[PDB]
Design an enzyme around this catalytic site. Structure first.
Site, PDB file in Angstrom:
ATOM      1  N   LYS A  76       0.830  -1.193   0.000  1.00  0.00           N
ATOM      2  CA  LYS A  76       0.000   0.000   0.000  1.00  0.00           C
ATOM      3  C   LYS A  76       0.869   1.249   0.000  1.00  0.00           C
ATOM      4  CE  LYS A  76      -4.039  -1.899   2.366  1.00  0.00           C
ATOM      5  NZ  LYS A  76      -5.014  -1.057   1.628  1.00  0.00           N
ATOM      6  N   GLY A 148     -13.111  -1.766   7.140  1.00  0.00           N
ATOM      7  CA  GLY A 148     -12.929  -2.307   8.472  1.00  0.00           C
ATOM      8  C   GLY A 148     -14.170  -2.793   9.191  1.00  0.00           C
ATOM      9  N   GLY A 230      -9.419  -8.395   4.063  1.00  0.00           N
ATOM     10  CA  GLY A 230      -8.349  -7.803   4.840  1.00  0.00           C
ATOM     11  C   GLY A 230      -7.990  -8.378   6.197  1.00  0.00           C
TER      12      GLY A 230
END
Lengths: 263, 263, 263, 263, 263
Positions: A76, A148, A230
């Site tokens: 990233k 998230g 993730g």
């Protein structure tokens, strides 16, 4: 050689990309069948709850992961932070993700991604943003979603919006296309290329909230080419089982009995 | 063959375009040294004061004017009214002006000007609009201004805005250009072509309020390539004298003594 | 027998409908080649100038016109005024126009047009309205536009909006169609029939502002099946010439040389 | 065959549906006389306390429950998450509940329920929503209410709204029905079918807040065909007693002495 | 002798300035290769944590640091607090930082920095502020950013804004420059000096959030001449390593492999 980058990113089609934080999670995500890993110091859950600023992952752990697995390895880079991109390209990673999941480094400008030989993965929320990122040099697009929470409402909305704009464009009258290009504030040449192809000129992944094999299959059935998973995989009761289940769901997104057996 | 249209419109550089309403005004505007005439039924002063809807000028008077003068002959077509453009192209005029001075025929969409072999003249108010019109197919741009009042404040503001955006673009960092293209909502390829050329990729005329030789010289010194003069010339005390004065001002925009003598 | 009404209105495709106010204007509009006439006591220009309320045209002049011409004869009925529609059907006219050009008789409800054996012509401004009117029983749709001004900006906007909704629907995903039907507040069965046919399930005319052959050809090229020309023809310098020109423009909407010769 | 699904859901008329979370609660709810159980991993109380996102219940516990009881077994599926519905159909459950009690998976679109052979149960808050869900393919409707509070004010308001709209429609003039269909944004054909039947064309249940036999009897007396009881029965002093009391109240919704004895 | 102060501040070009709080941190920051230290009692992190008002650092620790290192030593002075500046000049430090990181002492006025023989370092957020500070007497400018968070979004935005105004000014037409000087509220003479030099007439540093070598290299590539690193270096796992890495990044801001190795 932008077309070289596009063709290089094509081999990610129909796969799963998994956020890894160590060599062991990378090895698991490899054995589960992922097509690429996204090296990072600590999961997006940390970026969301723990707060603080999140930057490019540390080069030493990127090198460790790259030495631990054989699949393509991503990393990233903050938006507009072209020096983190330079560092990542100098490490030798396979794909760079100009990630909004991290902290914004340049609020107004993104990276001029034509300066790197490494293909970039850029987030998007609609057709205009995806086309702008493809014009800047992004060789692969992922729909933003929400980072998230494990809730795919926003990711589903973004996939549906992108594919709906594509379908609208496919029939749209030529004389109106220009105005459409102004409505999106997207480059007209890329708008016409989309209208000709019936899809984005690049690979198109989904990201944000994909936590169960049902979510991955839903993304792949809405038209995407892959998914990002993730943190919810390695924080669960069994990470290998859920990772293998999500990989099998992406591979067999049109097999309800398989989605049942993997769940 | 868009470049053919651009090169065809290049011969208008450094000239004056005069709104004519009959063969006699066309002959005068020819003998005054104009580079082209804009055939129309009744002056923009009529369109402003008398009200009502103003359309493409009548084909018979266009044919009469075209048979009366030898210079290029223009005509006005309503915005987005591509059938008036088809009629004008079938009459055989040299340039077509998608004129906002007339009544809007399509509020949302302009003509897909790539379908005609005749070069188009399109209005603009800033860099974004000029670039969008050039992308649609306009082979020549004129800055809008304000129609019918003889006050050049808006025309001057628009010339200054276009030339200022071009000067800003000329030095602008490459990595920022993309964002600039989004700020204008203009095609990025045309933005880069402008940044390379240092000017608008087509001929660039001024229009609206140009009434005295001082105004024409002002426009030509602000960076334009020509001027439009619509009604105040043939409603004055001496039309031939004022028309010749404005033509001489455009030809000698850097000669104050000449501007004095013609005034 | 709604399909009988639809097939009956089909013979109006590719024609012109002209508001007539006497047997002489009706005869002229017949010799110009119009496909139908819309009998009415005094022109929409009179509806605007004389003010007051406008109602269904007088039965005696309807009978006179019907005896004077051979083509189908229309008449206007106020919106939701089903008794005026009953009177018109009892006179024996061919088509009834539930016309918003007249004065509203029922602001909230339209005629339940399934109760009459005579086909109806209903105005519309978007796809939802057209589908609602087709569900109520309208056997032919005309796009509203704007009444009395001769400016086709609104008529063009409405044609473009209807055809754009149809083109959007044609590629729209089935699972989304339902939500689309809620966005328009249109019957879902008619929405699916439209999506299958690729066009509005009835004949689709244009109305409002069509004054010159260019406007009629523009409407017929935007996808319409015909045009309404109300008042600007018989208040002009030569009514027969302009009427014949508009008829020829509708018949030859793809012939620029013909549009030139008729103009 | 939508009529097959409708007739198949008919056997739930006059019964109680109880959310169960294990084979033991399922066995109790069966022995209490319930007509079906809504298998789910953790009660709405857990959705409130543990927070987070709630998804389709785990397939293993669904299979365990289905093997533990003989009555029809339901399961919840997120709104618009057609892949969870595919998984549930592949498990072999009897009814699928596109449940707003769970987390929204698609904010804009619901499942195109015509693609599954399994009947669906969709929530509603008024007549328009119930008709839209029946058009999408829902073979059974439950009034939304409010989830998890034990307060029936909202469930009562929604039941009264649906039954009041139906009573209004039953006498409504035909010529007005169309406008009514636009007021609700509901399919007109379903509106007319409701007007003919005097009730919703499917089985109509109540849900949200039903905690005591009085509440169940009140729902059944307001016109509903059944009730949903989710959590408050198995967290109370005696689950079997209260469950049997609610079942007896639904069966005998018109016997005040029975409601007293069971309370 | 303002030019003497400018030439004196020139030797800081291409270096790093590190906020130190004792002789030991000062010695470390010296061995890391920093060009100057900013003596202060407690880091900006401590200024944020302990709260309260922050003032000029204590003279005794300034003298200790000045006796401990050989490089130029800076100190902070509250904005408009010219008596703290007098005290600092009497101590004999090399550069004075009229620092907004500290607490404002004069909200409306800054120090008339022409009264001191010691060069000043003044914060800025745009071109107007930088030019105003250079007019007041500041011999070196640092872009403000945001104090204490480690997030460089604001510092990057300010560098981009200053360099963008400079690039805009460089091509700006002379006749417009005056208005530009009014738009910024900056002295016109300094605006013309900037337009002539193509850059800010003094040394231009970056400050706020620079925490990793990538951030320092990004600042030095955006056009700056150096960076400020305040607190995050000495609160980390290894202060000397990170300080040396940032120094090497500033020295080699165009070497990606070096930025990798030092990371």
């Amino acid at each position: 050689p932008f077309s070289v980058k596009v063709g290089l990113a094509q081999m990610l089609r129909g796969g799963v990309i998994m956020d890894v934080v160590n060599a062991e999670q990378a090895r698991i995500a490899e054995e589960a069948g992922a097509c690429a890993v996204m090296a990072l110091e600590r999961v997006p859950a940390d970026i969301r709850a723990q707060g603080g600023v999140a930057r490019m992952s540390d080069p030493q752990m990127i090198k460790e992961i790259k030495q631990a697995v054989t699949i393509p390895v991503m990393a990233k880079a903050r938006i507009g932070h072209f020096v983190e991109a330079q560092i990542l390209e100098a490490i030798g990673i396979d794909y760079i993700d100009e990630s909004e999941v991290l902290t914004l480094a340049d609020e107004d400008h993104h990276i001029n991604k034509h300066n790197f030989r490494i293909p970039f993965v850029c987030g998007c929320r609609n057709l205009g943003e995806a086309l702008r990122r493809i014009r800047e040099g992004a060789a692969m697009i992922r729909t933003k979603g929400e980072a998230g929470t494990g809730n795919i409402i926003e990711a589903v909305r973004h996939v549906r919006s992108v594919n709906g704009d594509i379908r609208v464009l496919r029939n749209m009258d030529d004389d109106e296309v220009f105005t459409f290009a102004k409505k999106l504030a997207a480059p007209y040449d890329l708008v016409m290329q989309t209208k000709q192809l019936g899809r984005l000129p690049v690979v198109q992944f989904a990201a944000g909230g994909v936590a169960t094999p049902a979510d991955a299959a839903l993304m792949m059935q809405l038209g995407c080419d892959g998914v990002f998973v993730g943190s919810g995989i390695f924080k669960s009761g069994d990470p290998a089982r859920r990772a293998r289940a999500i990989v099998q769901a992406v591979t067999h997104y049109s097999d309800p009995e398989m989605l049942v057996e993997v769940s």
